[PDB]
Design an enzyme around this catalytic site. Sequence first.
Site, PDB file in Angstrom:
ATOM      1  CB  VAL A  26     -58.852  63.118 -14.059  1.00 26.76           C
ATOM      2  CG1 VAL A  26     -57.813  62.011 -13.856  1.00 26.76           C
ATOM      3  CG2 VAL A  26     -58.175  64.467 -14.354  1.00 26.76           C
ATOM      4  N   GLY A  27     -66.642  54.802  -9.280  1.00 26.62           N
ATOM      5  CA  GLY A  27     -66.923  56.239  -9.296  1.00 26.62           C
ATOM      6  C   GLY A  27     -66.174  56.985 -10.393  1.00 26.62           C
ATOM      7  CB  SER A  28     -66.361  59.728 -12.499  1.00 28.68           C
ATOM      8  OG  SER A  28     -67.533  60.335 -11.987  1.00 28.68           O
ATOM      9  CB  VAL A  29     -61.376  60.751 -10.490  1.00 25.32           C
ATOM     10  CG1 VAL A  29     -60.321  61.617  -9.767  1.00 25.32           C
ATOM     11  CG2 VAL A  29     -61.586  59.431  -9.744  1.00 25.32           C
ATOM     12  CE  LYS A  44     -63.773  55.944  -6.505  1.00 31.17           C
ATOM     13  NZ  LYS A  44     -62.902  54.779  -6.076  1.00 31.17           N
ATOM     14  CG  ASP A 155     -57.675  52.780  -3.493  1.00 34.91           C
ATOM     15  OD1 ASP A 155     -58.693  53.089  -2.803  1.00 34.91           O
ATOM     16  OD2 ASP A 155     -57.312  53.434  -4.512  1.00 34.91           O
TER      17      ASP A 155
END
EC number: 2.7.11.24
Length: 326
Positions: A26, A27-29, A44, A155
Amino acid sequence: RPTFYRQELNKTIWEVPERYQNLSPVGSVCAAFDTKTGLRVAVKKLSRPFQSIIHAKRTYRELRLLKHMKHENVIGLLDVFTPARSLEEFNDVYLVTHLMGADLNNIKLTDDHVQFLIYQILRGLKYIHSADIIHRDLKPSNLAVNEDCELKILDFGLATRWYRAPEIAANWMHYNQTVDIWSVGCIMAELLTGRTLFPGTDAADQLKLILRLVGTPGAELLKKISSESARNAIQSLTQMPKMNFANVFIGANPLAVDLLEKMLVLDSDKRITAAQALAHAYFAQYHDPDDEPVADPYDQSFESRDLLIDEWKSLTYDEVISFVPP
Ligand SMILES: CCCCCCCCO[C@@H]1O[C@H](CO)[C@@H](O)[C@H](O)[C@H]1O
Ligand SMILES: CCCCCCCCO[C@@H]1O[C@H](CO)[C@@H](O)[C@H](O)[C@H]1O
């Protein structure tokens, strides 16, 4: 220790507890399904979390902040894990949060619904500000909602300068929590009108659009400007009055216009606070002064420290180990 499984996605090998199923980018998530709680979650995987002093302190900062946040209208931490069995092996950090459907960019809203959304932002902001945290980058993409219009402040995009307070965009050296109230004003205006209040094409244009609405700075504000060159630039501006907000937000609830007048003030000392705004008559149907909680004290003293990478890493490991789920 739970059972982990490995898979490749985003050209990295994600290693997560088996409770987290059907990971999809969908760092990476990745969105996932947590079989232990039955919740849909966002996982994440931090990128290069300890590559340098700066990365390591940022990793610690992110985890500490998420661990503190315990409020209905703010994103919180469901879980934090690492495949590492010891500090020595500790290289990867994964953060788990509620998966949110959409953001406020996605969603004419009725006045009742605009009240509900802004109420929730302010309820969350009251909490964040009570911890002496300033968001700095509130915007529709940092505001997550579910189908039932329930809102959480994020955030970052998910866990444009159109919404930034003018003092941030002008490099002020000191900041009020009320930078965030400017942002809320911009967001509310957009929910009322369907369009961006101040869609500046660059920093000059952004400031021009702002001053057109609110007027050029008055003598009371100029008294508090320490920068000689700033004062000179400001007084060389062609002077202009505050617009009548009613004539900009045609047909809006008069109480909405009043609240906008109280948020979108150039002088940050004169802006309404989140706590004050919650008590404004525009929110009468939602306001409950015994259900607008404040935060435990939040220790940001680490921000003033200069440590080695291994030191920030060990502190982050400590925070993973001590995590207790909600
Ligand atoms: C013409 C564009 C100039 C932007 C002026 C922004 C003034 C914001 O307001 C200022 O905010 C400061 C930081 O919180 C406070 O220290 C000042 O007292 C307050 O007046
Ligand atoms: C025409 C545009 C006017 C904008 C002025 C931009 C320069 C602002 O400069 C800022 O002024 C603040 C107030 O003294 C200080 O706190 C900051 O250190 C300084 O960077």
